[PDB]
Structure formats: C-alpha cells, structure tokens
Design a protein around this ligand. Sequence first.
Ligand code: TPP
Ligand code: MG
Lengths: 527, 520
Amino acid sequence: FDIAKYPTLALVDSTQELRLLPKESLPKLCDELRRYLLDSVSRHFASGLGTVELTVALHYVYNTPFDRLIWDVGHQAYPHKILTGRRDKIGTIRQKGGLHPFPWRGESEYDVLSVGHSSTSISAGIGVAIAAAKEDKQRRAVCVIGDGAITAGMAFEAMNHAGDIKPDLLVVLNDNEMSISGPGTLFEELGFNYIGPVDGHDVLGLVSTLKNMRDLKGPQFLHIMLPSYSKIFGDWLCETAAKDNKLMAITPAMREGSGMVEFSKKFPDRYFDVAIAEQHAVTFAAGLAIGDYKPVVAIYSTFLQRAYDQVIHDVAIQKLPVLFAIDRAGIVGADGQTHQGAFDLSFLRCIPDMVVMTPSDENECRQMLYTGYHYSDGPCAVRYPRGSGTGATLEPLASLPIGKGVVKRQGEKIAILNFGTLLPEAAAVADKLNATLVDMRFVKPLDTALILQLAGEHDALVTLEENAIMGGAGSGVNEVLMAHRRAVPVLNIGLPDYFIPQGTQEEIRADLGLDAAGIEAKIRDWL
Amino acid sequence: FDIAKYPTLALVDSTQELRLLPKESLPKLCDELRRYLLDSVFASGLGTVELTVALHYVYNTPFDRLIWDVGHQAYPHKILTGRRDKIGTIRQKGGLHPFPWRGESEYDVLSVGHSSTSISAGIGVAIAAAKEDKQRRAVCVIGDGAITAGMAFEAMNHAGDIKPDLLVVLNDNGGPGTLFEELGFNYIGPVDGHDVLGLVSTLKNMRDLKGPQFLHIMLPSYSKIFGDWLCETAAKDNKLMAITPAMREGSGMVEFSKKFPDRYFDVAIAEQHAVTFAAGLAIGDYKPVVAIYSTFLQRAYDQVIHDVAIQKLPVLFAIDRAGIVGADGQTHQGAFDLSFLRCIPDMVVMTPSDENECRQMLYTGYHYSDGPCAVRYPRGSGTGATLEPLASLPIGKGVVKRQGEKIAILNFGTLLPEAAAVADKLNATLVDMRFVKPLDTALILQLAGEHDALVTLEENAIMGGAGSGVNEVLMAHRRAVPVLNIGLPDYFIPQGTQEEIRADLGLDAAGIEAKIRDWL
Ligand SMILES: Cc1ncc(C[n+]2csc(CCOP(=O)(O)OP(=O)(O)O)c2C)c(N)n1
Ligand SMILES: [Mg+2]
C-alpha cells in the first residue's frame, strides 16, 4: 500500500478510525478510494465506483460492525470491503482462495449477510431490526438495495411486512446498482417514510441525511440517484422464431447471460424480460401456453430455485408444455457458492410429468431444445453449463426418442453412464479402462431397458453428472436397479455434499475430481 | 333439481341461457344461487355470487378467459358452468375438484390451489389473446390475501410495463387505488360487490377498455403438538420466535399467537419473506421457527438454500401437511420435501414417527446451532404415544424396533405402525430411521450385512426421497443388497380421505406386505 499516494485512505484502516476523521476530509477520502479501486481491481465494477460516497457515509455514521449494514447483491459492495480490512486483498476478488465477489459472513464481522442472489437484504434487515429492538441495546440496521433487486417479489413482500409491523430499518435504494450478473409514492404506499431522490455523490450531504434517518423510528426509505451454450441457445431461438409464430421466449432480467441479445432485436415481439422475477417468469409462460403459444423460459439453474413452486404447480400439475432452457448448470466458476447450478437434476426429477434432458455437447443441446419444443404432453427442461462446448457439428434437427440413451463405446466389466457435458472426460476414462460408455441424454424418463442391459453385462456401473450426487441423475439409476431387484453396485460421481467454492470452472472441476484423471482415480479407489 | 326453491337458477344450468336472461332477473338469480350454496355444500363462495353472475353474463365465456385465483370464491362459478348437480361431491374421492381444474371443464382456464397465480397467468393469456387477434378478452379474480404474494406484485409490475388487455378484479373482503395506479393499472373502485346490476354495467365498460384494468370490489393433531411445544418453549426462553405465512390456524398457532403476540409473526401469504425474515432474526441471535406446509415450502426453496443453508443459520422448519393431505388433492400434497431438502448441503431433515418423537425432534432442531433443521409431520392425529421428557436426539441415529431375519424395514416417519404390523407378520427386522439427513450410515451397512433385502418406507416421492438416500449409501459402499423403496408414486396424488388414499397407494399394512411379497 502506497501511503504517499493515498494519504487519507491510509488513515482509515478500520471504520473506528474512519469515524474519527474530520468531516471535511471525507470528499478527499472518497476521491482516494475511487482512485485506489481503479488502480487495484482487475478487469465490470461501475456500481462499485458509483457507491464510494454512500459507503463512506454509511460507515462514518453507523457504528459498524455493531450496527448492521446489509448489502443487497452487486459490486456496490467493493468499497465496503476496502474499508473493512480487505484493502490489500481486493485484487484477489473472484480468484480461487481469494475474496468473495460479494459480502460473505465467514469473511468478515462486517459482512452481515452472504448475498449473490438478489433482493434478500430487506427481508433479512427486517429480521435484524426486530431482533435489535428486542435486544434493547440501541443497535441500528440499514440495508442497501439496487433498483433491479427491488423488482423481485420477495422485496415487495418484505416492504409490505415492514409497513405492517414497522421495524426500525433504513432501506437505501441505490440507483447506481443494477443487481445482476413522483418516485416515492410506491414506497410511501407500502408504509415507508420516503426521502429523496438525493445526490448519491455528495458525501457530506449523505452523512447529514443518514445521521438523521438513523435516529428516526419505523421504516425509513432513502432514495439516492468456440460458441458458448448460451449463444447456441440464442441462435436456436432465432432459427425457430423465423419459421414458427408460436415461439415466445422469457428471461428474468438475464438477457445477455442467457445469450438472447440478438434474439431480442430480431424478434422483439417474441421476447419478454420480466425483470428479476423468476416466479412470474414461469407462470407468465404457463399463461402463454394456455393461450396456445410455445413459451421458452430461459433461466439459470441457481435462479430456477426461486421459481420451483411455479414449475410444480403452474406447469407440471397443469401438464403445460413449457420449455425450460437452464443455463449455468453445474459448476459456474468465479461467482462461487451462491450461484452454482448444483441441484436442478435433483429438484426437477422428483416432480411428476417433468422431462429432464442433459446434453453432452452443443449439437445435443440443439436436438434437445428442438425435442422439448415440439413435445406437447407436458414440460421439458434442457440444462447446460456456462462456457463453450466441444466444437461438435450442428447436425440437422430431429426429435430425439424420449427416454433413450446412446451407446458410445462397448467395453467390458464396467459401464459408465454419463449425464451431460462431462462426456469427453468419461470418454478418455472409458478408453483407458476399456469400459462401456453410454450418453444417457435423459435424466427423466430414464432409459430403464438400457440400464438393465448394462447391469446384466457388467460387474459394476458408474454414473456421472455435474449435479449433486444426493438425489441426482445417478441416484435415479440406483432407484431403477433396486426397483428391479438388481443390486449391481453403482459408483455415483457428481458434486459432493457441500456448497462449491469459487475458481475457474476448469480448476474447480479438477479439484472435485471431475476431470478424466479424477474420474479414473475415483473408480479405482471404489473398486 | 328443486325447481320450486330456485325457479330462475333452474333455467340457467349453462352460461348460454344465463346470457338470455333480461338484466332485471339477475338480482333474483343471485338470491337463489346464494340459497342453493347454503343448502348443498365456504363464506367466500357466498360472497362472490353477484360477481360471478355479472362476469359470466358480461364475458363471452368460455371463449373469453376468466381466471380464478384460489379460494372457495369459485363455488358459484361451477354451479353456473354445468356442474351444479355435482356440487355435493366437492373434495370427495372421485368428486369435483375444490377449485377450478383444467381437465374438469372448458370453463376452468387455470388449475389453482396455491394462491396468487391468477394475474401472472392472466397476463400470458391476455398477451396471447392480442396476438391471436380474434378479440378474445381476459379477466382474473384475486383475493385480498392472495395479492400479498411476491409473485402477484411481480405480475402487476410487468403488467404496468407491457400493458396487456387484462382486467384484474380484486375481491376484497391517499386511498386504496394509489398502489395499483403506481404499478400501472387504471383503477376503479372500491365498488359494491353485491350490486349485480352495478357490476354488469361496470364490467361491460371495463371489458372494452384497453390495457391493464383494475376493479376493486367490496388424540391431538401434530399441529396441536407443535403449537403446544412452541408455548412451552417460549414460556422459558425469550429467544423463541415463530413465523407463519398466513396459516396460523392450520399450523396450530392460535393459542401461541394469543399468549406470545410479541414473538409471533404472520407475514401474510409470503413464504419467501417468511424464510429470509427468519434468517435475519437468527443473525440477530434469536431462534426463529418457520411453520410452513410442505407444499408451500416449495415456494421458499431459494430462501432455504441461499438465505439459510449457505449462511449456516440455525433456523428451525416445522413442516406441517407432510405426505398425503387428503381432501385438498394434487395442488396441496406434501409430496416432495424429503427429496428437495436432502440434496441441499448442511440441512438436517427429521421425520418423527409419533407425537413424542415429534416433540423430541423439535427440541433437537431448536437446540442445534450448526445449521438449519427441518421436522416434517402430516396433517392429522398421532398414535397416543406417551410424551417423554425432552432431550436432544443423537444426530443421524436410528432406533431398532424389532429384530427379525431375512428382511429389514427402514421407516422414515408416521407409517411406522404399518411397518410394525408387517414386520410382525413377516418376522422382519424393523428400524425407525428418524433422520433423512444425515442418515445412520453405520446402521444401514449393518442391516445390509445381516439381511438378504432391505425395504424403505416414507410418505414422500420415491424419486429422490429418503429411501433413495439409503440406496446411495449402499452403492457408495459397493454393497449388493437390493432395496425395495416404498413411497409416493410418480404422479400427483388426487383427493380423498387420507386413510383411503394411503390405502389406494398401498401405504397401509396390507399394501406394504403385498409390495414386499410381489417384489421378492
Ligand atoms: C402460496 C399459498 N400460501 C397459502 C395458501 C393458503 N390460503 C388459501 S386461501 C387464503 C386466503 C385468501 O382467501 P380469502 O382472503 O380468505 O378470501 P377469497 O379470495 O376466497 O375471497 C390462503 C392464505 C395458498 N392457497 N397459497
Ligand atoms: Mg378474499
């Protein structure tokens, strides 16, 4: 740290020291903190730059870490980490072993809530504030939420509840944060005292306003002013819409991530961004299907968690033919635990009347989208990872036989049953071990006849998937075998029973034993 | 039927004769329909008589799409859409569904049961209708409780953005309109919801308006065991807090709400906020208990995963209506919580087999500080088990109930009396497993080494369920002992009494014995 470059930032290693600075020094501190961020974080974080003055004001006014400051998701919280003891580590953000992208409870007493999904801050802040009142030590609570995050249903539920029971909570609406990857009437109607919009870049103005609002009772609201699978999906949307008036596609505020930018411009009448609203995304699709359109819900595995009840109740129970294009399935890399696509094979396959498909390459991905798009008896899901595929030829489209796998190699003694994009690693292993290899294609319905044939011809089976082992695709294979009283041992390879930490997709797969070398070692150790 | 008592209603078994009535007969029609409901079948259905008459009189149903949010507000709808001769079978095995059900009538646009789905679906129907370009109209009816749900706000906010031709009727049982105006609706009301002629005139106008329109009209059960336990714990522990998403009576919380009002939080129909609010209380070093039905917990799954499990916060989930729920049918079954909770890291999942176990497990999860715990139990009465003094149960350990030979039955939950009869008949070993997660791995492997076959029993989907986790342990240890997994089949379970639906699915002693004998 170059104390001569940042002589004011040099004085405030702790927020206790920050609170001792003369107020007159705070604009210079904000300049230095903005320069230090630019000089220090690797190439993205415009909302971090835009929240510098707010962050200084908040830690200057609130007695953190005793008073509780809860950040909603976003790079708005980078300056926060710099001021709470992690200045010299800020260049490690998102690296394996480095700082978390967002506040993480285990990382600092100053991180009240681990975030990553959006819109959780107000709800948690109401709990913290109710607890603070009962504790009766005059602890205060503030949360900072971006304008994207405030579109989610659970933020409305939280604000409505705050209007009812009237916690002593300050909510700061930060228009600098987008929350992904006049103005006060609504919040007043929900029961808040509303101030603003104020200048979010006036550190002294914010200190004065926050000092007053921190002392008020009840709910307070301050308003401050080579191809990726995603590209494969977006290309397929465009090809399909060009020939079929029925296709409609929906994203809950993840147009760029899900690969839909070109589609949104070529087919604007087929494209719906419903904001950060996964639950509405799904039930809106159910309504389009009742209307005899063919909706595709583009949604990340991790965010689909939040729309589970709409998948079960508003789609599967109705047998409506909605197609789910599930991106960021499996290991997602840099965003770490809060974002992994770790559970969708488990939580979707226990639901009746769901078809669940796991392509092993980008051709299979297209074939499965096509198959699910023309499958009319009920909903279909196709899940695929962040990142590139194998370079597979994109073959002419044809519906795949439902619930049938594909034999890739005939070997002996061991059969490997692959679900999804780890197939090239399993192919290397099966050559090395002279094993049988099968690309299962379908997690549900499973190819039971192929499972029984494999079990009748090998001493042991291996299942492979980029999902939790517990309840996952391989667990489904186990169930078929046991139902047929064929107790042939199966090694279920997949994600272990802990939340998967950050790193490159490649290095985290290797750490989990999900490359060819890891898979081979697991088989040998188990045999 | 009884033409004498209802001489206007008698002539309008379908909406086509309904629309042939002169306006002047609709008031008498409404009186007759209300009396018919009183005689043939709750309060919310009585309350929607006039609205229902007005809607079907003005809208060209079933071509125009009318969507009902959940509630017995839809009983009159079924009487006017050709099903009045069946209204006496509602909620019975083989009878009419309690709520509109797509397969039951072309007048049922959306199957409902969970709340707050009507606006979202209505926006899709309305967007489809505009693209169809055949002048089809769309209208939905939502209750004042259902509009508290986060997905209803998401839908209203999207309606304000894309401006579909949809009428939302708030069936409400400054000013109230400002919120809906700010979300982007044209707001009318509040109006008299029992002036049928006034509603016909208003609906006629608003059906013809473009864009988003908003019309505002004016032995103890396990639940009791849980509520009693909350009271006893809060009496001696200031940290206890209990949360319900608007299901106070069903979750057994009435007395608790009256004795501990300062520790009781009804968050409205807001499962998502219920869970993350609990996470905040736990961060604040209180001990929250979230009371929630299995089927509704589906809607808070992301908050369980991201705001509780990833945080390692020690929230207690008291999961009622687990397993087969009986009369409410498919939309309400507690069919999946053992599957969707056990794949989540750092979750403890407990399945008590009687009232005493239920209390022991609530106490155990309440005093477990390393992460969240869930205790799931069915609707209905327990066995009469003696309530023993409370102490924490050793984590991930099951109990041997009977020693036999050849077969071992591994029970998760309240079908244990049935497993016990079977175990006697077959001279099978019987184990009460207690924990779905973590499993008693040591015991599973000992049972497999001592028997030719295992049987698992749970009142949850077989797919992904507790017995599926036993399979996984055996496979991980490269064992070769087959396991019969007994549980809920892979279809949504229809309505009936709990006893008769369990019998149908083979989850009584007789059906379990038969499944074992057939499989061997
Ligand atoms: C997600 C969800 N949570 C809880 C329920 C339980 N529930 C059924 S009806 C109701 C209240 C709404 O009905 P009401 O206000 O009594 O009058 P109505 O709309 O029938 O006229 C609730 C909370 C539900 N159906 N869905
Ligand atoms: Mg109501």
